[PDB]
């Protein structure tokens, strides 16, 4: 009857105690509390909300529901980035050597999984020889020595969040700030982060549609982090169009190398500097965000970020010479320009659908077992706001296949041309405290 009293307490607008929240999480996790009571509680939470203390308690109970990662043998303050991510987002690829070049320790755990493109592992494996088979001890020593390493992440983290999120998805209770914010924060805390940088996407197609909605979620997650002793900062950035030009795996390694040299697309340059600035301050490698940006800009210009990327590849078996000559990367058999049928200004690129078209070329997994061709993908040749003439290529498709008509039709259906267009501002808001 204890769960029923907990439901009624939340139903009545009361705060749940620390005891009650832990009882619920641990009993739901071990199967003693049934799905139907958890869904009832989640719906009562959807309506009644949770205080900051309840949100912190729920976050940490989910952290403590399964295995946790202890990174304390890695010297320094380990900052991790959570992004809901988006098409063309190379920030993780760029950020790891970029901030490591400032001695920010990057103890990166990632995987593969589904999506429109590969995971970080898939993208890094486009480099020949690169592999993630490290013991924890090797992983610790590589970060301590070179300040960057990647190991495959554990699959036994926050089992309570995996259960609860799946339940929320089939009961109409995803869209609750306390539930979203504790879900995201608990995964990063259980992974051993000392501090956390949030990239909260907003705009057309994103989960948070408005800057105001995204800011509300970011502030809730920042409050949780500070309440549980893991200092947290957020960037609210626009995802209405894909980031950069390259959409794929090897194509994004190639573009990331441009960004690491201080060149490459303007938007990813600005987002990487903005996110990296917060990481550098949180790790206590610069005193202000302006100073952190200056230091990041400088390791871009003097080539130390690129040098860090070479060391990182070399330490885990990859052919580092590909940084100096990215044509060594996997190339696709066919390169097909998709010419614009109309003249004007590119007014919309439906980012999620361009991602699907990339996947339909073989760039990501729709189902769990699918194979990824790391050479295929899409190069955007225009972004929102760019002028375009009839016949001028909108995108270039990189394919291992002769016929891509379905991919062509999807590109055309999801890129609009108007007489006038203005891209959204990329960086909407920063939450630094």
């Amino acid at each position: 009857m204890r769960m029923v009293d907990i439901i009624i307490k939340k139903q009545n607008g009361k705060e749940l105690t620390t005891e009650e929240i832990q009882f619920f999480v641990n009993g739901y996790t071990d199967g003693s509390i049934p799905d139907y009571q958890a869904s009832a509680l989640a719906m009562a939470i959807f309506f009644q909300d949770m205080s900051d203390r309840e949100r912190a308690d729920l976050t940490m109970a989910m952290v403590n529901s399964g295995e946790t990662i202890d990174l304390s043998a890695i010297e320094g303050i380990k900052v991790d980035k959570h992004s809901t991510g988006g098409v063309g987002d190379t920030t993780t690829l760029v950020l790891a050597p970029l901030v490591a070049a400032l001695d920010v320790p990057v103890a990166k755990m990632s995987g593969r999984g589904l999506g429109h493109t590969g995971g970080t592992i898939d993208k890094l494996e486009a480099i020949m020889g690169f592999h993630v088979e490290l013991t924890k001890d090797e992983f610790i020593k590589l970060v301590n020595r070179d300040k960057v390493a990647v190991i495959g992440q554990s699959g036994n983290l926050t089992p309570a969040d995996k259960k609860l999120y799946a339940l929320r998805d089939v009961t109409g209770t995803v869209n609750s700030i306390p539930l979203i914010a504790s879900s995201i924060m608990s995964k990063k805390i259980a992974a051993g982060a000392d501090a956390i940088v949030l990239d909260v996407k907003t705009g057309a197609g994103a989960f948070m549609k408005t800057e105001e909605d995204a800011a509300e979620l970011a502030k809730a997650m920042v409050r949780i982090g500070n309440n549980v002793g893991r200092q947290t900062m957020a960037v609210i950035s626009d995802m209405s169009q894909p980031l950069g030009f390259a959409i794929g795996n090897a194509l994004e390694v190639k573009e990331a190398i441009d960004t690491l040299k201080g060149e490459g697309p303007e938007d990813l340059h600005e987002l990487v500097l903005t996110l990296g600035s917060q990481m550098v301050v949180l790790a206590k490698k610069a005193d202000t965000l302006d100073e952190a940006r200056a230091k990041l800009e400088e390791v871009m210009k003097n080539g130390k970020a690129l040098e860090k990327f070479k060391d990182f590849l070399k330490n885990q078996g990859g052919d580092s010479s590909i940084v100096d000559d990215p044509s060594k990367l996997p190339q696709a058999a066919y390169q097909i320009d998709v010419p614009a049928k109309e003249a004007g200004v590119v007014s919309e690129i439906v980012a999620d659908e361009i991602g699907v078209a990339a996947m339909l070329l073989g760039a990501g997994r729709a189902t769990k077992e699918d194979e990824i061709d790391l050479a295929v993908g899409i190069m955007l040749r225009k972004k929102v706001g760019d002028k375009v003439e009839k016949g001028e290529p909108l995108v270039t498709l990189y394919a291992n296949r002769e016929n891509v008509d379905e991919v062509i039709a999807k590109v055309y259906d999801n890129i609009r041309i108007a007489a006038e267009a203005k891209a959204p501002k990329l960086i909407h808001t920063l939450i630094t405290e």
Side-chain angles (χ1 to χ4, degrees), residues 43-59:
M43 183 65 65
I45 288 168
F46 176 94
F47 280 100
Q48 306 284 57
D49 210 336
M50 272 179 150
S51 65
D52 280 356
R53 198 266 303 145
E54 297 182 276
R55 291 174 182 189
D57 280 351
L58 177 60
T59 302

PDB file of all heavy atoms in Angstrom, residues 43-59:
ATOM      1  N   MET A  43       2.165  10.128 -14.239  1.00  0.00           N
ATOM      2  CA  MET A  43       1.103  11.028 -14.666  1.00  0.00           C
ATOM      3  C   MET A  43       0.762  12.028 -13.571  1.00  0.00           C
ATOM      4  O   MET A  43       0.484  13.198 -13.859  1.00  0.00           O
ATOM      5  CB  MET A  43      -0.141  10.229 -15.075  1.00  0.00           C
ATOM      6  CG  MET A  43      -1.271  11.085 -15.607  1.00  0.00           C
ATOM      7  SD  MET A  43      -0.887  11.940 -17.167  1.00  0.00           S
ATOM      8  CE  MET A  43      -0.707  10.551 -18.281  1.00  0.00           C
ATOM      9  N   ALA A  44       0.761  11.588 -12.302  1.00  0.00           N
ATOM     10  CA  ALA A  44       0.560  12.545 -11.226  1.00  0.00           C
ATOM     11  C   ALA A  44       1.692  13.567 -11.195  1.00  0.00           C
ATOM     12  O   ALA A  44       1.460  14.751 -10.928  1.00  0.00           O
ATOM     13  CB  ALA A  44       0.433  11.818  -9.876  1.00  0.00           C
ATOM     14  N   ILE A  45       2.924  13.127 -11.477  1.00  0.00           N
ATOM     15  CA  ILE A  45       4.041  14.062 -11.587  1.00  0.00           C
ATOM     16  C   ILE A  45       3.841  14.992 -12.772  1.00  0.00           C
ATOM     17  O   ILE A  45       4.060  16.205 -12.675  1.00  0.00           O
ATOM     18  CB  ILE A  45       5.370  13.293 -11.683  1.00  0.00           C
ATOM     19  CG1 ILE A  45       5.708  12.673 -10.326  1.00  0.00           C
ATOM     20  CG2 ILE A  45       6.519  14.231 -12.121  1.00  0.00           C
ATOM     21  CD1 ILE A  45       6.835  11.650 -10.361  1.00  0.00           C
ATOM     22  N   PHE A  46       3.407  14.448 -13.906  1.00  0.00           N
ATOM     23  CA  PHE A  46       3.130  15.293 -15.063  1.00  0.00           C
ATOM     24  C   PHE A  46       2.251  16.478 -14.683  1.00  0.00           C
ATOM     25  O   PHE A  46       2.488  17.609 -15.125  1.00  0.00           O
ATOM     26  CB  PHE A  46       2.464  14.469 -16.172  1.00  0.00           C
ATOM     27  CG  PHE A  46       2.047  15.292 -17.367  1.00  0.00           C
ATOM     28  CD1 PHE A  46       2.880  15.414 -18.452  1.00  0.00           C
ATOM     29  CD2 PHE A  46       0.813  15.939 -17.391  1.00  0.00           C
ATOM     30  CE1 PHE A  46       2.512  16.173 -19.555  1.00  0.00           C
ATOM     31  CE2 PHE A  46       0.435  16.712 -18.481  1.00  0.00           C
ATOM     32  CZ  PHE A  46       1.291  16.831 -19.568  1.00  0.00           C
ATOM     33  N   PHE A  47       1.237  16.240 -13.846  1.00  0.00           N
ATOM     34  CA  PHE A  47       0.316  17.298 -13.458  1.00  0.00           C
ATOM     35  C   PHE A  47       0.844  18.160 -12.323  1.00  0.00           C
ATOM     36  O   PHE A  47       0.652  19.383 -12.339  1.00  0.00           O
ATOM     37  CB  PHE A  47      -1.033  16.691 -13.065  1.00  0.00           C
ATOM     38  CG  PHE A  47      -1.870  16.352 -14.247  1.00  0.00           C
ATOM     39  CD1 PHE A  47      -1.946  15.052 -14.715  1.00  0.00           C
ATOM     40  CD2 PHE A  47      -2.502  17.357 -14.944  1.00  0.00           C
ATOM     41  CE1 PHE A  47      -2.704  14.750 -15.842  1.00  0.00           C
ATOM     42  CE2 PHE A  47      -3.252  17.071 -16.075  1.00  0.00           C
ATOM     43  CZ  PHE A  47      -3.346  15.755 -16.523  1.00  0.00           C
ATOM     44  N   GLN A  48       1.319  17.511 -11.262  1.00  0.00           N
ATOM     45  CA  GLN A  48       1.750  18.217 -10.052  1.00  0.00           C
ATOM     46  C   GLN A  48       3.208  18.712  -9.920  1.00  0.00           C
ATOM     47  O   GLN A  48       3.500  19.555  -9.071  1.00  0.00           O
ATOM     48  CB  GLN A  48       1.271  17.435  -8.820  1.00  0.00           C
ATOM     49  CG  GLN A  48      -0.237  17.155  -8.840  1.00  0.00           C
ATOM     50  CD  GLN A  48      -1.062  18.390  -8.496  1.00  0.00           C
ATOM     51  OE1 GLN A  48      -0.947  19.423  -9.155  1.00  0.00           O
ATOM     52  NE2 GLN A  48      -1.898  18.288  -7.458  1.00  0.00           N
ATOM     53  N   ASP A  49       4.109  18.198 -10.752  1.00  0.00           N
ATOM     54  CA  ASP A  49       5.496  18.648 -10.774  1.00  0.00           C
ATOM     55  C   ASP A  49       6.270  18.150  -9.553  1.00  0.00           C
ATOM     56  O   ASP A  49       5.739  17.420  -8.699  1.00  0.00           O
ATOM     57  CB  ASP A  49       5.557  20.180 -10.863  1.00  0.00           C
ATOM     58  CG  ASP A  49       6.799  20.699 -11.602  1.00  0.00           C
ATOM     59  OD1 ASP A  49       7.842  20.009 -11.671  1.00  0.00           O
ATOM     60  OD2 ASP A  49       6.715  21.840 -12.101  1.00  0.00           O
ATOM     61  N   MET A  50       7.539  18.536  -9.486  1.00  0.00           N
ATOM     62  CA  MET A  50       8.438  18.173  -8.404  1.00  0.00           C
ATOM     63  C   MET A  50       9.288  19.388  -8.065  1.00  0.00           C
ATOM     64  O   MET A  50       9.664  20.155  -8.951  1.00  0.00           O
ATOM     65  CB  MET A  50       9.331  16.993  -8.792  1.00  0.00           C
ATOM     66  CG  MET A  50       8.745  15.630  -8.520  1.00  0.00           C
ATOM     67  SD  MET A  50       9.827  14.277  -9.036  1.00  0.00           S
ATOM     68  CE  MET A  50       9.373  13.013  -7.839  1.00  0.00           C
ATOM     69  N   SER A  51       9.563  19.575  -6.777  1.00  0.00           N
ATOM     70  CA  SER A  51      10.459  20.645  -6.370  1.00  0.00           C
ATOM     71  C   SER A  51      11.886  20.347  -6.821  1.00  0.00           C
ATOM     72  O   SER A  51      12.208  19.255  -7.304  1.00  0.00           O
ATOM     73  CB  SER A  51      10.436  20.821  -4.855  1.00  0.00           C
ATOM     74  OG  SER A  51      10.949  19.657  -4.228  1.00  0.00           O
ATOM     75  N   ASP A  52      12.754  21.341  -6.629  1.00  0.00           N
ATOM     76  CA  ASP A  52      14.167  21.144  -6.926  1.00  0.00           C
ATOM     77  C   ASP A  52      14.755  20.014  -6.087  1.00  0.00           C
ATOM     78  O   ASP A  52      15.499  19.177  -6.607  1.00  0.00           O
ATOM     79  CB  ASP A  52      14.930  22.448  -6.709  1.00  0.00           C
ATOM     80  CG  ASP A  52      14.775  23.414  -7.880  1.00  0.00           C
ATOM     81  OD1 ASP A  52      14.138  23.021  -8.872  1.00  0.00           O
ATOM     82  OD2 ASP A  52      15.312  24.543  -7.820  1.00  0.00           O
ATOM     83  N   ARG A  53      14.371  19.921  -4.805  1.00  0.00           N
ATOM     84  CA  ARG A  53      14.894  18.832  -3.981  1.00  0.00           C
ATOM     85  C   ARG A  53      14.406  17.475  -4.486  1.00  0.00           C
ATOM     86  O   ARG A  53      15.195  16.531  -4.603  1.00  0.00           O
ATOM     87  CB  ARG A  53      14.520  19.053  -2.507  1.00  0.00           C
ATOM     88  CG  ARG A  53      15.349  18.239  -1.502  1.00  0.00           C
ATOM     89  CD  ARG A  53      14.664  16.918  -1.127  1.00  0.00           C
ATOM     90  NE  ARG A  53      13.312  17.116  -0.585  1.00  0.00           N
ATOM     91  CZ  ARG A  53      12.293  16.288  -0.790  1.00  0.00           C
ATOM     92  NH1 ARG A  53      12.445  15.196  -1.541  1.00  0.00           N
ATOM     93  NH2 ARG A  53      11.114  16.560  -0.259  1.00  0.00           N
ATOM     94  N   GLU A  54      13.098  17.352  -4.776  1.00  0.00           N
ATOM     95  CA  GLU A  54      12.579  16.134  -5.393  1.00  0.00           C
ATOM     96  C   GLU A  54      13.310  15.807  -6.699  1.00  0.00           C
ATOM     97  O   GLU A  54      13.635  14.646  -6.963  1.00  0.00           O
ATOM     98  CB  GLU A  54      11.086  16.272  -5.683  1.00  0.00           C
ATOM     99  CG  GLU A  54      10.191  16.452  -4.441  1.00  0.00           C
ATOM    100  CD  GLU A  54       8.728  16.536  -4.845  1.00  0.00           C
ATOM    101  OE1 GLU A  54       8.262  17.640  -5.208  1.00  0.00           O
ATOM    102  OE2 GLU A  54       8.054  15.488  -4.823  1.00  0.00           O
ATOM    103  N   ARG A  55      13.555  16.811  -7.536  1.00  0.00           N
ATOM    104  CA  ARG A  55      14.233  16.545  -8.807  1.00  0.00           C
ATOM    105  C   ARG A  55      15.639  16.003  -8.589  1.00  0.00           C
ATOM    106  O   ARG A  55      16.057  15.044  -9.260  1.00  0.00           O
ATOM    107  CB  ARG A  55      14.263  17.815  -9.651  1.00  0.00           C
ATOM    108  CG  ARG A  55      12.870  18.191 -10.150  1.00  0.00           C
ATOM    109  CD  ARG A  55      12.896  19.523 -10.843  1.00  0.00           C
ATOM    110  NE  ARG A  55      11.558  19.934 -11.283  1.00  0.00           N
ATOM    111  CZ  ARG A  55      11.331  20.984 -12.061  1.00  0.00           C
ATOM    112  NH1 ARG A  55      12.343  21.694 -12.529  1.00  0.00           N
ATOM    113  NH2 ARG A  55      10.094  21.301 -12.414  1.00  0.00           N
ATOM    114  N   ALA A  56      16.384  16.605  -7.661  1.00  0.00           N
ATOM    115  CA  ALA A  56      17.710  16.093  -7.320  1.00  0.00           C
ATOM    116  C   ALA A  56      17.622  14.682  -6.747  1.00  0.00           C
ATOM    117  O   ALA A  56      18.408  13.801  -7.118  1.00  0.00           O
ATOM    118  CB  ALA A  56      18.383  17.025  -6.314  1.00  0.00           C
ATOM    119  N   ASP A  57      16.668  14.450  -5.836  1.00  0.00           N
ATOM    120  CA  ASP A  57      16.529  13.123  -5.245  1.00  0.00           C
ATOM    121  C   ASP A  57      16.244  12.079  -6.313  1.00  0.00           C
ATOM    122  O   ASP A  57      16.801  10.978  -6.282  1.00  0.00           O
ATOM    123  CB  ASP A  57      15.411  13.102  -4.188  1.00  0.00           C
ATOM    124  CG  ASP A  57      15.844  13.671  -2.845  1.00  0.00           C
ATOM    125  OD1 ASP A  57      17.043  13.939  -2.651  1.00  0.00           O
ATOM    126  OD2 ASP A  57      14.978  13.826  -1.958  1.00  0.00           O
ATOM    127  N   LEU A  58      15.326  12.385  -7.235  1.00  0.00           N
ATOM    128  CA  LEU A  58      15.001  11.440  -8.295  1.00  0.00           C
ATOM    129  C   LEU A  58      16.200  11.199  -9.204  1.00  0.00           C
ATOM    130  O   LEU A  58      16.465  10.061  -9.618  1.00  0.00           O
ATOM    131  CB  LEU A  58      13.811  11.962  -9.105  1.00  0.00           C
ATOM    132  CG  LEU A  58      13.327  11.165 -10.317  1.00  0.00           C
ATOM    133  CD1 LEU A  58      12.884   9.773  -9.904  1.00  0.00           C
ATOM    134  CD2 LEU A  58      12.169  11.925 -10.986  1.00  0.00           C
ATOM    135  N   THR A  59      16.906  12.268  -9.567  1.00  0.00           N
ATOM    136  CA  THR A  59      18.115  12.110 -10.379  1.00  0.00           C
ATOM    137  C   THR A  59      19.085  11.128  -9.719  1.00  0.00           C
ATOM    138  O   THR A  59      19.498  10.132 -10.329  1.00  0.00           O
ATOM    139  CB  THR A  59      18.774  13.471 -10.590  1.00  0.00           C
ATOM    140  OG1 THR A  59      17.848  14.369 -11.214  1.00  0.00           O
ATOM    141  CG2 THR A  59      20.045  13.329 -11.457  1.00  0.00           C
TER     142      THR A  59
END
